[PDB]
Amino acid sequence: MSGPERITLAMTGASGAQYGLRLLDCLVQEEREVHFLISKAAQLVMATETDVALPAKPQAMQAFLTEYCGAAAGQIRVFGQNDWMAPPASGSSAPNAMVICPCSTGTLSAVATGACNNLIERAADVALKERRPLVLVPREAPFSSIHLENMLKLSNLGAVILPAAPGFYHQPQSVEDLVDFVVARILNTLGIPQDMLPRWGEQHLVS
Amino acid sequence: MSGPERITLAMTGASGAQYGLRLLDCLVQEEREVHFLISKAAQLVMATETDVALPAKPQAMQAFLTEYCGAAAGQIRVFGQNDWMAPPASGSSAPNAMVICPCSTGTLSAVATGACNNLIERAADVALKERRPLVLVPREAPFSSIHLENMLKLSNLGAVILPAAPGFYHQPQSVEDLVDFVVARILNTLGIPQDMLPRWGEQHLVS
Amino acid sequence: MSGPERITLAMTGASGAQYGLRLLDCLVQEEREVHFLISKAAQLVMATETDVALPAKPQAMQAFLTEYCGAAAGQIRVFGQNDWMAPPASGSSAPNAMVICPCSTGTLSAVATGACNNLIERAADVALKERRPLVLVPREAPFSSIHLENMLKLSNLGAVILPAAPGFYHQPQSVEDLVDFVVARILNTLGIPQDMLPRWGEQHLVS
Amino acid sequence: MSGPERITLAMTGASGAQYGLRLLDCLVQEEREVHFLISKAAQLVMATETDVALPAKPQAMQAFLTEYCGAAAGQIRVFGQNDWMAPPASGSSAPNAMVICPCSTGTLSAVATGACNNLIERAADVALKERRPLVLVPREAPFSSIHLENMLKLSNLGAVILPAAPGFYHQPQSVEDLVDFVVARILNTLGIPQDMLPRWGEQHLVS
Amino acid sequence: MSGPERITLAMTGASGAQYGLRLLDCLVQEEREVHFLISKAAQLVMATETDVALPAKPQAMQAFLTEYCGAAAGQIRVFGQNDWMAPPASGSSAPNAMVICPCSTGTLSAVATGACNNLIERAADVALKERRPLVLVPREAPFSSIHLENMLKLSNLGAVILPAAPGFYHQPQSVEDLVDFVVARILNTLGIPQDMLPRWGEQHLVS
Amino acid sequence: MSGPERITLAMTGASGAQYGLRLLDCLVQEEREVHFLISKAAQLVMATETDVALPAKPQAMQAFLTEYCGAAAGQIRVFGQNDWMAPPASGSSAPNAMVICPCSTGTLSAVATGACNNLIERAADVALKERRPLVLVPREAPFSSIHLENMLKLSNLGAVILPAAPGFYHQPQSVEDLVDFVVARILNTLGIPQDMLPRWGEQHLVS
Amino acid sequence: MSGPERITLAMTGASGAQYGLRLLDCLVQEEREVHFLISKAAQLVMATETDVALPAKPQAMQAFLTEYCGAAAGQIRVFGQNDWMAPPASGSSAPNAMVICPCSTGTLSAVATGACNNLIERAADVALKERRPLVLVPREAPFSSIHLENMLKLSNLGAVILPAAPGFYHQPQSVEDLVDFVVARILNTLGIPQDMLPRWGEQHLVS
Amino acid sequence: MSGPERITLAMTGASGAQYGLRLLDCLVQEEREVHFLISKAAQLVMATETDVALPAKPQAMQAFLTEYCGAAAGQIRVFGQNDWMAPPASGSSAPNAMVICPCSTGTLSAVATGACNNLIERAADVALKERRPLVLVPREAPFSSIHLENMLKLSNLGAVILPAAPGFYHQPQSVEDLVDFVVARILNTLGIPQDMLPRWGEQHLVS
């Protein structure tokens, strides 16, 4: 396969739960192992913005997502917010790429300062110290100077700051076409195949 | 009225022509005077992403937009890319708020460095020196460190960096609901009434 | 009226509960709507430093403060520390000015880094991104370099850092005269009328 | 004794003359030698805010303060604003701790830039170059970014920035209880005994 | 005695519980008063890495450690994570030196930003503002740029960053010899006698 | 194979010769080519801390290490401190990963400033300019601000700063278990297989 | 005694050998233990500028200086430029204050960058990491921006930059009076008694 | 002639009046026009440190210095501290080199901040804006970080920071030989002939 075998997917409490669920579904279809983390505020966002009824405890959640995505047994792992025995908590774990989608401004702040107050924050801290891929998908507007400084610090270090800012150049016709644009970008960044967004200009020889 | 009487609306060559046209339409419905500027690359984007057939020369363009928006005669002014005799070129002009929507990374760069190579860039340079409102609506992903440094420099100065990153917390059902989210934010930032996006929590007394 | 119609008043766990209660009372007398937030540590400070017996749950608290201040029904709203459905949590809310009085060094840190770990921190993050008034009233001594850097970063962005450092130039005769000095400064900063602190030199024509 | 034998106490033209006089009295009661400096603006503040009738010339001033404090002959020395032959002017002097209480924003600026335009400013410049204790007690609100940058620069160098921001956690009952809080902090910082402010938690074993 | 009478010893959730317990034992043998704080994650680390069965509540914990160390009654105080009435919470407390051993990257971050979210973080914030000794003993590898910036900021302020990086120049023969190397360095830094690590070169006159 | 075929292993004069020798042995067992460099001070450290009798001249040294490690003929190359004709001296060489283990503070300084005064320093300078892997394993305590600034500068550029700070979370029972922890981290960072340190949480599915 | 029992005195190759020899003599008369280091260039300077015939090897040098100063046996220790077994090389040594007098611009550079290329440079690196007194006495003119940046970096960390810039305010009558001025300042900085330079203003009561 | 025809020589209140008087005498002997400025504190220093009885008012001072130096009529001009009609006050004046010898730390501060509070400070401000030579001769020890930052800022701009730190490499035999060393350096920097300090190595061909 091209791209990482394992992805840590963390969903935090920005608007855009749809982007996280669609990414999880795409990663499952590409036969990747997903270590799934979700914050308390992100549970509230998913309850507010979607009709997904996500169970709260990790084992129930894991069984639900496995069914939702049509995943294989053990393909999706779910770890709680204080589970320091989970792989993402330590850099001695097997290497994963990590994506925080959506990434709240609070989680962006914790990653930029190194707060490590829960497993999502520590997992990102570990990605940075081990030089493993870290993609943050903020959804906010305006972005204040506090947000922008945190994004710049992390981008300079090598994290990818990929805002949930879909393009329109393929004439999207639904909300799902816009969600898929951003998910396609995340997968492209990870090196994972995707067929939702064409390769710009691939057939253009000259003019 | 609340908010500015005159807005300079510049459209530059990022994806998201729909956001600029919808904003222009909203500003027209709120009886504002609009000084409309559009870059050459933005003309190509609007031809690519929309079915709007925008004439190229300023007088033809002005007549077309006036009809498209149902604007009053003289409500929309159109100025060419090198028209230094137009109001946005000088700080001795009557005060306007300015919005660049969509804002390409190239235009964001020119504003942050002060390049003033065309009327959009000079008009933003003038907004900054006169302390008049300047809102930039970038549409790009990932945002690189070059993009983020330019955004931070401008935000620290007092420009509003408002990415085209729509929220989902009112369960959008179409592309237009997502376009309207971002346009509502721009209007809110300008102080101009809008009824597309509710006031969060306005009826929530306690819990 | 002059000044904002709505103020978000957050009390956090620095010494000086008296300043927050007196400000709340003044804002009520000036017929303003107050969205009142209080941290867990600030509840302990108010229990320690005052004889105010503040109930813990938001509805009981709201009823108590309404009676304490002689407020109109619905004039004081109380929101809990994780209530993301409350107006201060989103920039799509109606605009309010925000004051954190007293502001602990921990809350000052969270605002400067963008931590957003509770509704007070997120509400300040939202004030900054929307360019709405934000006044922080720290009470600490010494101020360390960590405190001072956080204050400078926020002041450079446009927050007002208004320490609880009363002046003596009107020969104060009680603790309340010193509390009123600082509250008068906050109200002056907000643009809200106050008659506790005279306008310096207003009758001085020459010398 | 614990703490310094000699303190240079400079009073400059911020509000809060009471803090300087109370500190002088406490230092006298602790049998310390005080080198007392006072600016022209601080003389005006003491005339405005207190009923202390302080004579203007150094010898008359010295005799007055000696009587006011019940000091021993020669315990309080008074030096004029241009007296470069006084001990605080040179680092070849015997070592003293220095406190500027109250510290105006102008004096804070001079210390941070090294202006040395009078004996107070030079004495602080000398404390810094010799690594002798320097405590600044600003009284201002708001603190602007100019004030905060000057405070941060000096704090990073090792000066203590101790704002006149009294705490309330011992339920103060008078203006004097609040003045004594700040004076207690200064003495604590200097290492000089004081019995006005208890040692927090000293009898708390567990909970 | 040489060195401080009282030490605040905080253990946080980095690997290396052995260093904290050995330091506590050494400080007890040197007849020092210890104010002992431990984070929730550090309790899990001590359960994972050691055979010490540490009770969870502060009074039970205090009684256990008193027996483990052979301490005198009241020599070890234990305070909970939110106990703001404990001495380390306020700079008006009696002066202590503070050591965080081991220091997690999350606690290092909180100290560098001033987050004060629990008593360990606030106690370090207080050490810095009062200029009292603060020694951080991080255990992590690699150290990322986020870790290193937090360490540099604190070191520039005057905190000692003492990594758990034992030397081998006395030919250690057990894990305990390596634990004792680091503990000896901490005690040396505090000015507290220790006989585990010889004074390098003390008998070398020339060569 | 996974990871680099060739590693430049430089040992410099920090304590911890054991880490360098164990790493060399592991790299030999993984059939890697090693270009081995050692400073004069590191020779003294190895004589002081170990019972390894390392010959001083490069050919004798090469023959000794080949026997010590059970290496194949030509698998270990040894180059002298001024050998500019050796592969590590030029970026036109075949690509190698480089590790400095242990890394003295002096060598860390030379790499951060670009001093290139010997082949170890130049080889690191070359790794940086060619963007080849560079891992520094400092062993020092405390780390001063000079050390930390040099580490941050290099980490921001992309070098891995991996302190000799072993973890204890697998209950180490000997000095060798702690040496192996750090060596395992280096090999993990290089992408080279190792079976000394388990993959954290690899069998943990949920909780 | 007041001040340190042991001083590491390093002489490096700036002009002003007289200041180093006079300081060594004063420290001997004050019954201090001196660990004496001298660079190769400083030997040339002492041969050029003085009639002191200093033997080159450490034991001969030690015997010569002992006789020159009238020191007790073992009061002056001499260590060679690569003697890493000497006390100044390690922070596990007994604590000493360190003075580099004169300090060449090259040695100032090495200390500011952390080069540690000889025992003088490492000894200063160790003073900084252990927070032990470090006084640098540069003699150069002009001071370039490279010199000044190195001095500022070190001063901000807590080293004392004490240029060989004698004062004239006691009407010096010989070269020795000017040498003694600077030596008096060094001793004052160290806290060591000296009777060459009076305490400025000590008898001035008022004016 | 080589070097400038006109020099503005300002003496400010650092110790070292001898350097200023000797420089004035040398410039007179080299037939240069000198615009002489002296601060009030520098008058006190010259009264304290020398037997020069300098009259206070500019015309009397001018006549005295003309006689002291054996200058031609009009060769030395003297301007008062507030004389804005004097040539040094404006950059439209004829070009002069400027030297401040000695330069107090207060004058160094004013030049680095641009305070222009008297003619010496404004004259230096004018030298900088016109890119005319500016040489500052500070005499202070220690130099604090405030002094060093002011010196670095000015050196980076192109001012020469030439401390009064005489060399000894020509075996000086009197105070005057040391004064002449520094004066020779100033003249060398200005490009003005001097025969007090030989050209180092001028006759050394090889070795």
Ligand SMILES: Cc1cc2c(cc1C)N(C[C@H](O)[C@H](O)[C@H](O)COP(=O)(O)O)c1[nH]c(=O)[nH]c(=O)c1N2
């Ligand atoms: C319905 C809804 C919608 C949003 C939010 C909340 C809720 C309930 N929050 C606020 C955010 O959740 C809050 O600051 C949390 O503290 C973030 O915590 P986590 O980073 O998820 O731990 C939020 N935060 C943000 O950065 N971007 C956003 O778009 C939104 N939108």
Ligand SMILES: Cc1cc2c(cc1C)N(C[C@H](O)[C@H](O)[C@H](O)COP(=O)(O)O)c1[nH]c(=O)[nH]c(=O)c1N2
């Ligand atoms: C269809 C299409 C789509 C895009 C673009 C172009 C075209 C033709 N370009 C590139 C952009 O137009 C180019 O960098 C121009 O140089 C921008 O010039 P102006 O800032 O408009 O003068 C572009 N640029 C960007 O910053 N964000 C984007 O989303 C896009 N998308």
Ligand SMILES: Cc1cc2c(cc1C)N(C[C@H](O)[C@H](O)[C@H](O)COP(=O)(O)O)c1[nH]c(=O)[nH]c(=O)c1N2
């Ligand atoms: C009685 C009392 C008095 C004080 C405090 C506490 C208590 C109980 N705390 C400490 C502060 O409450 C602690 O750092 C909290 O973590 C702050 O949390 P919040 O910012 O309120 O969420 C405190 N903090 C501070 O910054 N300034 C202060 O004056 C005080 N005084």
Ligand SMILES: Cc1cc2c(cc1C)N(C[C@H](O)[C@H](O)[C@H](O)COP(=O)(O)O)c1[nH]c(=O)[nH]c(=O)c1N2
């Ligand atoms: C009655 C009164 C009250 C104040 C002041 C003045 C007077 C007369 N000033 C202004 C201050 O004195 C002025 O900026 C001086 O220039 C300060 O000079 P010194 O620093 O004392 O030399 C003043 N300055 C300040 O920094 N904080 C304050 O609280 C006050 N309050």
Ligand SMILES: Cc1cc2c(cc1C)N(C[C@H](O)[C@H](O)[C@H](O)COP(=O)(O)O)c1[nH]c(=O)[nH]c(=O)c1N2
């Ligand atoms: C067994 C074990 C081992 C470690 C950890 C955890 C556990 C359970 N954690 C992670 C750390 O505990 C987590 O980031 C916490 O959030 C730290 O919180 P406190 O700083 O203790 O409040 C951890 N953190 C770190 O900085 N260095 C380390 O060596 C380790 N090792």
Ligand SMILES: Cc1cc2c(cc1C)N(C[C@H](O)[C@H](O)[C@H](O)COP(=O)(O)O)c1[nH]c(=O)[nH]c(=O)c1N2
């Ligand atoms: C036995 C022994 C032990 C140590 C040292 C030396 C010796 C002989 N040195 C000092 C170091 O070797 C010295 O600063 C050298 O200048 C480093 O030179 P290289 O970087 O190897 O060229 C040393 N340096 C350091 O950074 N960390 C350490 O742990 C030690 N320990």
Ligand SMILES: Cc1cc2c(cc1C)N(C[C@H](O)[C@H](O)[C@H](O)COP(=O)(O)O)c1[nH]c(=O)[nH]c(=O)c1N2
């Ligand atoms: C007679 C004589 C005089 C001086 C010098 C040399 C000699 C031989 N050198 C130059 C200095 O010695 C050279 O840069 C060395 O490299 C410094 O090395 P150390 O720092 O002593 O190891 C010199 N360097 C300096 O910084 N200030 C000075 O005053 C002098 N003067």
Ligand SMILES: Cc1cc2c(cc1C)N(C[C@H](O)[C@H](O)[C@H](O)COP(=O)(O)O)c1[nH]c(=O)[nH]c(=O)c1N2
């Ligand atoms: C006898 C004597 C000696 C000195 C001083 C003074 C006196 C009277 N002063 C202090 C300096 O004069 C004071 O800070 C003035 O404010 C400087 O003002 P001018 O820069 O001359 O306007 C002083 N200042 C300094 O920077 N270096 C020094 O060597 C001395 N020495």
